[PDB]
Amino acid sequence: VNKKTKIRHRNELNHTLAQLPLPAKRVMYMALALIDSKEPLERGRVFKIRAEDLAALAKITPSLAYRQLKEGGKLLGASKISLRGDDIIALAKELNSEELDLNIIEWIAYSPDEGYLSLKFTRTIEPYISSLIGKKNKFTTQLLTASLRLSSQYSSSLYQLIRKHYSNFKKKNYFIISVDELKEELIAYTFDKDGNIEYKYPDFPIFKRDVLNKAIAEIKKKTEISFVGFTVHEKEGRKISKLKFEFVVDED
DNA sequence: GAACATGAGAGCTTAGTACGTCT
DNA sequence: GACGTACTAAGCTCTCATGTTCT
16 A cells, blocks of 8 residues: 555565565565554454556556466465474464464455455464564565566565665665575575475576676666675685675665 | 686567457 | 456576686
8 A cells, every 4th residue: 555665574484475476476465565564463354455456556557467466366375484494493482282384375265357366364474474573683674566566586586685684774785695595595496306406597607697687687677776786705716605785775 | 727707599488568348 | 447368578597609817
């Protein structure tokens, strides 16, 4: 509601959001837009989400919004909370003979002639939006309208990460991160039938070009984040190990 | 040489459009 | 409005290719 709206969730939830296909992502943020982040949820609480509002907010033709809503709804239905793994120690305790379920969604339905979707969260997810207001750094806040406009898995993830690291509330913010921790943050990876990781742009200069730049481009182009740059932070002999990202944000 | 920065693009998937339709 | 259809732009992942520097 309105265009300077903010959504807020526990840091522990970032990875789950990053995993979501763009459409589900979209419906998820809309749902959060509807939430007073500081209070509990009525538990038996239903969220109508309207393609109309999506469209207006994401600057997308309504036709698409209808599609994306319906589809995002399906996908969200399937989606689970991605927890790893001592972070699961937290959750278990927080939430306390019955079982642990990691679905984001308890119930969901599009209304085919009616231009909207309805939705109900599971108790599990609740602690990730009902959120005793300190300590400030347990949380990520972002701008709903930026979140919605992004249209790239990498773009979004980067935007979130940056936001996650937006502590100062004044001019120049920055952070250090390792290439792989980044790739993990961006979901620039896969697996397959063997267990372990498989990174997506194995040789950096190609990664930098096909992911980091394109990404940085679009953020600058579609968001409040005014400047974003990054530099090699530490040696690594010849190879590249850690980047320092800097960024300023428009308070407008 | 082993690491980077660049770029054109192949081949294939997804995000987006215009536009007709019908109370 | 709330689509469905039919098409285009844009996005993804990896590969050839031309060149530069590191330390």
